């Protein structure tokens with residue numbers, strides 16, 4: 086089987102499980118020697134690789150941070166920091182749209198996506214530009230969509 | 236005043252400091268003591284400099300929609316969700332959709348972005364992809380020159396170079 090095995094010395098020797106690299110090919114005495122990937126390294130396949138793949142750095146200069154895989158078996162994702170979203174056209178993190186007064190941010194907020202803004206409905210207001218703040222209820226004592234009752 | 240509304244509250248003729256995001260007002264200030272501000276409990280949050288006697292409860296990210304919480308333990312901000320690995324939030328359906336798979340000869344642009352669809356790009360000469368995958372980038376060809384071997388099979392953007400096992404003089 087090509088999936089679990091490679092051929093060497095006229096026999097089918099076993100490939101390395103995801104998370105492990107092929108340190109030594111099989112011998113006339115031994116099957117393959119497979120060792121765990123080091124820090125920030127991975128292999129997500131049954132393989133014959135002589136080294137693990139290194140996770141791409143998430144560039145802090147682009148406002149990116151790492152999303153932890155909690156394993157050595159998955160490729161690692163990055164994401165824009167809270168309040169920012171990845172734009173594939175600029176290939177850059179943009180500030181999330183601030184919903185103007187009279188509008189509120191829709192929840193739940195989606196990581197790495199821009200804010201959806203919706204108008205405050207009767208009985209609710211928003212007095213700030215914010216990419217996170219929902220519309221707030223009027224305090225019970227005239228209010229508008231942009232201002233609380235006085 | 237100079238008791239700044241942004242960071243303070245008035246109580247019994249005194250200027251007292253509001254609690255930081257992530258903490259709630261356990262007890263108001265006294266003549267010889269500050270505000271007692273204590274952390275919000277598990278699953279709870281407050282996202283403003285506040286004078287709240289209790290914190291708000293986080294809603295779970297909807298697993299039925301294939302969403303997962305990011306930094307679920309954050310007490311200082313409203314919760315953010317993201318589609319599970321291999322899926323992206325689609326704004327048209329407001330839902331998680333399976334990531335685009337890059338065909339053989341194409342690779343995923345790295346680093347992969349959480350909650351975003353895979354962007355697929357052609358493998359350059361010297362690199363290949365033999366599978367449909369929303370994660371795999373193009374892999375460099377095996378280097379037979381490095382080993383001083385001849386090639387048994389020419390590489391393509393869809394298949395790896397294969398080195399000969401034969402020796403030459």
Ligand SMILES: [Cl-]
Pocket residue numbers: 139140141160161345346347
């Ligand atoms: Cl990676």
Ligand SMILES: [Cl-]
Pocket residue numbers: 183184185188202
């Ligand atoms: Cl707006």
Ligand SMILES: [Cl-]
Pocket residue numbers: 292293294312313314
């Ligand atoms: Cl929340």
Ligand code: NA
Pocket residue numbers: 183184185186187188189190211212213214215218
């Ligand atoms: Na607003």
Ligand code: NA
Pocket residue numbers: 337338339340341342343364365366367368371
């Ligand atoms: Na591919």
